[PDB]
Amino acid sequence: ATLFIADLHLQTEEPAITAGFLRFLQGEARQADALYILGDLFEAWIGDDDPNPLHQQIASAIKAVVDAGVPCYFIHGNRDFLVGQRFARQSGMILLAEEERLDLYGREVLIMHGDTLCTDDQGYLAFRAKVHTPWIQRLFLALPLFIRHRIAARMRADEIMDVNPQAVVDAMERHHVQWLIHGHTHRPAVHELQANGQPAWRVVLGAWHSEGSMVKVTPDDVELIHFPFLEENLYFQS
Ligand SMILES: O=C(CCCCNC(=O)Nc1ccc(S(=O)(=O)N2CCN(c3cc(Cl)cc(C(F)(F)F)c3)CC2)cc1)NO
Ligand SMILES: [Mn+2]
Ligand SMILES: [Mn+2]
Numbered sequence: 001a002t003l004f005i006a007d008l009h010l011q012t013e014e015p016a017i018t019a020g021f022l023r024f025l026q027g028e029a030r031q032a033d034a035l036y037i038l039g040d041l042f043e044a045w046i047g048d049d050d051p052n053p054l055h056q057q058i059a060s061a062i063k064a065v066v067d068a069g070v071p072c073y074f075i076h077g078n079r080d081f082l083v084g085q086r087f088a089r090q091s092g093m094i095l096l097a098e099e100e101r102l103d104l105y106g107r108e109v110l111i112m113h114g115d116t117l118c119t120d121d122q123g124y125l126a127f128r129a130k131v132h133t134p135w136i137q138r139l140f141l142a143l144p145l146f147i148r149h150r151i152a153a154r155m156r157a158d159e160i161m162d163v164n165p166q167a168v169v170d171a172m173e174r175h176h177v178q179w180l181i182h183g184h185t186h187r188p189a190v191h192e193l194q195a196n197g198q199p200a201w202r203v204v205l206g207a208w209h210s211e212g213s214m215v216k217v218t219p220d221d222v223e224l225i226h227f228p229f230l231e232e233n234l235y236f237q238s
Contacts, residue, residue, distance in 0.1 A: 029072075030070060046145070065092075101177060116167075163185060203222060
């Protein structure tokens with residue numbers, strides 16, 4: 001099986017999510033053929049030189065999955081688009097492009113974070129175009145870490161728009177797939193549509209708000225799975 005997760009929004013103020021992700025990496029992920037993280041792994045990212053201990057904790061945990069023989073891949077989200085090759089090396093993850101076509105047991109599947117499908121949010125797409133401009137990222141990353149932290153804290157102090165159905169069809173026809181997996185919108189669901197003259201499906205990951213969410217693709221099926229962060233020990237009441 002191949003696993004997909006997204007929209008964890010890890011942060012030191014939410015240790016329950018971190019614990020849930022560490023439990024996921026120690027258990028389920030170790031049995032996978034591959035793990036794809038489709039963006040928004042972190043609530044924020046201001047560059048790989050950030051000494052935030054959570055980053056090293058997460059990198060070590062992911063690296064243990066990689067060393068266990070499970071390749072891990074990352075597509076950037078709207079929150080963590082500055083994740084770079086230094087973190088990729090620390091974590092053992094492979095950085096992928098904003099759209100990737102996968103062969104999953106003979107099924108061609110398009111994966112992406114999903115924010116680029118939300119083409120009705122014209123203001124966001126303009127912001128996205130700016131912060132994905134390479135010379136702008138290079139200038140921001142050049143600023144001192146304490147400045148970047150102040151910029152980020154100020155900006156974060158300032159409802160997620162859903163996908164545009166025509167953008168979905170465009171993407172699945174550009175890639176000639178019948179299957180699309182994405183996150184970003186926080187509306188876990190399976191949508192049927194038509195692409196390339198045939199039925200097509202759009203599978204949406206959940207955010208890790210109160211429980212975890214993953215998509216698990218097998219040779220036989222596609223599974224959207226919700227599970228508790230921590231081991232829920234049963235006990236009995238007379
Ligand atoms: O609705 C939708 C979309 C949903 C809403 C999208 N909004 C959203 O993602 N906001 C946001 C994301 C990340 C952060 S951050 O804290 O991690 N961090 C802030 C500073 N960052 C920066 C980088 C560069 Cl290159 C340049 C600058 C500059 F020039 F501004 F200083 C700053 C790096 C990132 C802060 C806010 N879809 O339907
Ligand atoms: Mn998200
Ligand atoms: Mn997002």
